[PDB]
């Protein structure tokens, strides 16, 4: 059917010196450089290092970006023996990671996102050097099968624009109504030499540790590691459903080069027309683009054509010049291949968080052979806010939400572009959920066993000291956990009315004290027997409903750490709350590997 | 946008014991098993071979579905040097031969096929053995870049399924707007002894040379080779343009299986729900689907699975019992694995064009544990006519179309349906183009060289004697040739006004005889200076118009033969004849390798 707007209501990603998307941003804020020294423990760099370029079976740099943990999963917690884990790509041990991370940063369980199954998995992947070899279709697959999700399920391949052709098929499916949400993203890991030597046969990497997007003395990209997902669900249902919506998905589109003078050159003219084409079925006109997202590779041929075809795409609708700031992640983390168009999108959504635009790095000097003033854009250089623009169109003037636009083109010349704008909420604040004292919040968190749980609660604890989370929150704070995290079978419960007396109560518990007002513990495991014969009939969900409302807490919370399944949603008569990003859970972080 | 009909314009593909598909439907006529021992220049099959299953490192079958000529390619066509030749995974050369086919086979070369560039491709693969790497992205991308396409050009990745995902993100393509034509397909070889040992380790494979579709005795598949792939174009603009048209398009699914007992277990209720929702998206009541192209794999799990979701989606229609036929091509090639989608197509086309029903092998005894009295279906054990149904339905009976559905099924769950009816022309035959001795036709081939041009002439007197054309073919035969030919290097040009002048010009040519009437030979490579500087004004191209309409047609292909460039479709005023299958380009046959 018909483009129409799509909510991403959830995100999750690892990338290089990012361990989650917190991370993320504070690197790119900063202007960090997140660039290192191959890891010893993937190879010895030394052992193929040869400063000639295009040699044979071996690489001329020492640097990528990669990310940590990159050979750690929890596979207990998905019921995965040690031994398939060690069978499993890494890319499809972390995909499914960060995939289920970012149902819980959307305030969803696999069962409550999408009641009828029908979740799309759109993954996008290119390189498949794990010695049990390339098996893309199970980096999705895992994912649909674990969680029960029965929408459509798919890895794709256009190399380097792999994630963001994974969204644009997400969406797709989407307007057709074979997915009613979906997860999308893609996945880049770098797990034997012969990834670089490949690359440098090519010469298509950089000697150095900086990626120079748009800069001077360019010489090509500076490999990376990276992992993404998020979720998407149409936005009218997102709002009605009271999500925390990231930004709207407006229009996509995908493309190829066609004939270029070689194979693998890209093709400005098809940039150009993408560009175009993604923005008309956007119904965005390109003077109200305020930041574009470039593929910005770096290369000394890449880059100049990018820039041109995105301004000949803007000249379509506006001739005026240096209104648009321009950037790319890779000058922070490197190319990270097929996961680049996500790792992209994230930085977006950042930028869309905090209303700020931040330095795309290793241009100073610009590309010399770049005349910016020619163009609708302006390399950003420092961190600035980002001003929603007044723009005069129709003879009618007024202020934009922030847009922007992505690019991702793989070497083959597939290309993709997506347009987001920021999500404005009206301006509703009832706010009849006040949590007070007279009117306390329950706080219910839970682990497959103590020593995660500890960590969860570690987690939340920092977490509300790292974002400032006070009062205010708590409502949303507790709503999420009771419905947006699946109840494990180590659990504890709390009851608050204000964030202090909950920190001072998680606290207390991290502290090793044994009895704490008002926190109730326990395990599933041990109650299972009179669990199963006394939940079958709602005649218990009513008297649930009854002790909710006389607000027997202190006992539903005692039944409840024993394994006694509670409809927290019971507890909202009039309203609802809104599901907040929150802490997710904290796999554990084991090691797994084959042998070739 | 909305799902609307889809034409199949174009064809072509290679199987076991297949080289064309005229071959592919011999074989499924005759109800040959193409099953063969595995060949030693591909490995040594007693160097890994022990009788005991899910031994590790070794192989329980000497059996497989084997494409001949697996390692040949003409990489001097595409301008391909031999050494990156050497390096392309043959899944990549063997595909490229076979999308540029498949366009030849609908009548256009890659200019016409689609003025606005707007070509999509879409292609299925899932295994990436091949020594230089699994690189599945540059199998859709050659095509693109060197037939200038600038639709989305994507490699999917489902398992199995691949080749009928690969089609139904075509369609959706193609609903879109996104292209406006459309190469879908799929591709899978077996090049190394680890994939055998893979699915040995998994006991997935049969020990013996059939694979049991619905028979009794099913112990696992055969595992197979193919490559093919479609041409799609919207239904309305193919009848327009005169195009000959496999089939319509009236819908598709893709879905999966969610949770399951155990990873790759499939699931009968999600395949019900896909087989339901194509079912709906192409408006076709179950009662009038008159065959069944079974995924059919053989697997004593599977094959019940598969009838009882197949049963479960057409009994929301309806409750009549065998009236349904249902077959799988595996029980004849193998299960090819990603190709297996497009094998599947390609056998239903066939059946359509001769509205005939094959034999699906080895179910002389049908698998015990499936009752088909209680289902839709019969299994088809014998070739018959494929009848159009007699079905009432709202209390009104009618004759419905052959309507034909086909299920493919990933081993991670990711499954797909498509539904295909058969074209049935309005009945306008003027036939003013009728070709006589006064009304002469002119027949133009070409190839690269002598030796390519001699084998083309070679296959069209075959293809004339094997499909017994005549002389009211000849309006279409030349017609595909003029315009449906990318006019190459050595040419030749006949002026006949019967078939059997044409095969008798034609045979003398074949026989080596130096000067033949109205038969005009000659090479580009001889007079490109005087080409230049001629053609580029409209002045000579009206001149061409006159010697048409004057009619001197040996000036015009003495002139043609040396590399004056004829605008052919002017030669018709009034009305367009039909385009028309006939042999395509006879790559040439060279060995290319790499070293692992």
């Given at each position: 059917?018909?483009?129409?707007?799509?909510?991403?209501?959830?995100?999750?990603?690892?990338?290089?010196?990012?361990?989650?998307?917190?991370?993320?941003?504070?690197?790119?804020?900063?202007?960090?450089?997140?660039?290192?020294?191959?890891?010893?423990?993937?190879?010895?760099?030394?052992?193929?290092?040869?400063?000639?370029?295009?040699?044979?079976?071996?690489?001329?740099?020492?640097?990528?970006?990669?990310?940590?943990?990159?050979?750690?999963?929890?596979?207990?917690?998905?019921?995965?023996?040690?031994?398939?884990?060690?069978?499993?790509?890494?890319?499809?041990?972390?995909?499914?990671?960060?995939?289920?991370?970012?149902?819980?940063?959307?305030?969803?369980?696999?069962?409550?996102?999408?009641?009828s199954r029908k979740v799309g998995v759109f993954v996008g992947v290119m390189n498949?050097?794990?010695?049990?070899?390339?098996?893309?279709?199970?980096?999705?697959?895992?994912?649909?099968?674990?969680?029960?999700?029965?929408?459509?399920?798919?890895?794709?391949?256009?190399?380097?624009?792999?994630?963001?052709?994974?969204?644009?098929?997400?969406?797709?499916?989407?307007?057709?109504?074979?997915?009613?949400?979906?997860?999308?993203?893609?996945?880049?890991?770098?797990?034997?030499?012969?990834?670089?030597?490949?690359?440098?046969?090519?010469?298509?990497?950089?000697?150095?540790?900086?990626?120079?997007?748009?800069?001077?003395?360019?010489?090509?990209?500076?490999?990376?590691?990276?992992?993404?997902?998020?979720?998407?669900?149409?936005?009218?249902?997102?709002?009605?459903?009271?999500?925390?919506?990231?930004?709207?998905?407006?229009?996509?589109?995908?493309?190829?080069?066609?004939?270029?003078?070689?194979?693998?050159?890209?093709?400005?003219?098809?940039?150009?027309?993408?560009?175009?084409?993604?923005?008309?079925?956007?119904?965005?006109?390109?003077?109200?683009?305020?930041?574009?997202?470039?593929?910005?590779?770096?290369?000394?041929?890449?880059?100049?054509?990018?820039?041109?075809?995105?301004?000949?795409?803007?000249?379509?609708?506006?001739?005026?010049?240096?209104?648009?700031?321009?950037?790319?992640?890779?000058?922070?983390?490197?190319?990270?291949?097929?996961?680049?168009?996500?790792?992209?999108?994230?930085?977006?959504?950042?930028?869309?968080?905090?209303?700020?635009?931040?330095?795309?790095?290793?241009?100073?000097?610009?590309?010399?052979?770049?005349?910016?003033?020619?163009?609708?854009?302006?390399?950003?250089?420092?961190?600035?806010?980002?001003?929603?623009?007044?723009?005069?169109?129709?003879?009618?003037?007024?202020?934009?939400?922030?847009?922007?636009?992505?690019?991702?083109?793989?070497?083959?010349?597939?290309?993709?572009?997506?347009?987001?704008?920021?999500?404005?909420?009206?301006?509703?604040?009832?706010?009849?959920?006040?949590?007070?004292?007279?009117?306390?919040?329950?706080?219910?968190?839970?682990?497959?066993?103590?020593?995660?749980?500890?960590?969860?609660?570690?987690?939340?604890?920092?977490?509300?000291?790292?974002?400032?989370?006070?009062?205010?929150?708590?409502?949303?704070?507790?709503?999420?956990?009771?419905?947006?995290?699946?109840?494990?079978?180590?659990?504890?419960?709390?009851?608050?009315?204000?964030?202090?007396?909950?920190?001072?109560?998680?606290?207390?518990?991290?502290?090793?004290?044994?009895?704490?007002?008002?926190?109730?513990?326990?395990?599933?495991?041990?109650?299972?027997?009179?669990?199963?014969?006394?939940?079958?009939?709602?005649?218990?969900?009513?008297?649930?409903?009854?002790?909710?409302?006389?607000?027997?807490?202190?006992?539903?919370?005692?039944?409840?750490?024993?394994?006694?399944?509670?409809?927290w949603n019971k507890l909202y008569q009039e309203e609802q709350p809104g599901r907040?990003?929150?802490?997710?859970?904290?796999?554990?972080?084991?090691?797994?590997?084959?042998?070739?």
């Open positions: 059917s018909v483009v129409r707007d799509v909510a991403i209501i959830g995100l999750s990603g690892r990338y290089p010196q990012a361990k989650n998307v917190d991370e993320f941003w504070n690197r790119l804020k900063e202007g960090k450089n997140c660039i290192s020294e191959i890891p010893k423990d993937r190879w010895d760099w030394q052992s193929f290092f040869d400063e000639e370029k295009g040699k044979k079976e071996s690489m001329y740099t020492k640097w990528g970006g990669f990310i940590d943990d990159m050979d750690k999963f929890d596979p207990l917690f998905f019921q995965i023996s040690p031994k398939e884990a060690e069978e499993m790509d890494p890319q499809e041990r972390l995909f499914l990671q960060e995939a289920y991370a970012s149902i819980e940063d959307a305030g969803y369980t696999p069962t409550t996102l999408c009641e498949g050097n794990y010695p049990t070899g390339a098996t893309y279709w199970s980096i999705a697959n895992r994912l649909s099968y674990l969680l029960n999700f029965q929408g459509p399920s798919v890895a794709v391949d256009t190399a380097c624009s792999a994630s963001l052709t994974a969204i644009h098929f997400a969406l797709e499916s989407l307007y057709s109504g074979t997915s009613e949400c979906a997860i999308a993203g893609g996945v880049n890991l770098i797990v034997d030499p012969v990834h670089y030597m490949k690359l440098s046969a090519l010469t298509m990497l950089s000697p150095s540790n900086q990626c120079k997007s748009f800069g001077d003395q360019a010489d090509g990209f500076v490999d990376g590691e990276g992992v993404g997902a998020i979720v998407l669900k149409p936005l009218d249902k997102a709002i009605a459903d009271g999500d925390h919506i990231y930004g709207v998905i407006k229009g996509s589109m995908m493309n190829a080069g066609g004939k270029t003078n070689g194979y693998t050159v890209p093709n400005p003219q098809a940039q150009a027309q993408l560009v175009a084409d993604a923005l008309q079925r956007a119904n965005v006109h390109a003077r109200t683009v305020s930041y574009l997202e470039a593929h910005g590779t770096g290369t000394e041929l890449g880059d100049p054509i990018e820039v041109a075809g995105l301004t000949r795409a803007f000249e379509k609708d506006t001739q005026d010049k240096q209104f648009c700031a321009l950037g790319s992640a890779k000058s922070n983390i490197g190319h990270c291949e097929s996961a680049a168009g996500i790792a992209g999108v994230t930085k977006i959504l950042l930028q869309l968080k905090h209303a700020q635009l931040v330095p795309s790095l290793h241009s100073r000097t610009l590309n010399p052979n770049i005349d910016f003033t020619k163009t609708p854009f302006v390399v950003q250089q420092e961190l600035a806010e980002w001003r929603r623009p007044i723009v005069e169109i129709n003879g009618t003037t007024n202020e934009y939400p922030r847009i922007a636009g992505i690019s991702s083109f793989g070497a083959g010349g597939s290309n993709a572009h997506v347009i987001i704008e920021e999500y404005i909420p009206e301006e509703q604040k009832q706010s009849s959920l006040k949590i007070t004292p007279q009117n306390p919040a329950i706080f219910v968190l839970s682990a497959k066993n103590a020593e995660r749980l500890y960590e969860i609660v570690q987690q939340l604890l920092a977490f509300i000291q790292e974002h400032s989370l006070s009062d205010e929150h708590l409502a949303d704070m507790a709503y999420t956990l009771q419905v947006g995290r699946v109840a494990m079978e180590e659990r504890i419960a709390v009851i608050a009315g204000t964030m202090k007396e909950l920190q001072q109560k998680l606290t207390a518990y991290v502290k090793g004290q044994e009895h704490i007002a008002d926190l109730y513990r326990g395990q599933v495991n041990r109650n299972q027997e009179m669990l199963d014969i006394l939940t079958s009939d709602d005649e218990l969900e009513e008297t649930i409903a009854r002790w909710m409302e006389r607000g027997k807490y202190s006992k539903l919370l005692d039944l409840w750490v024993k394994g006694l399944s509670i409809d907040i990003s929150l802490p997710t859970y904290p796999f554990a972080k084991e090691s797994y590997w084959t042998h070739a």
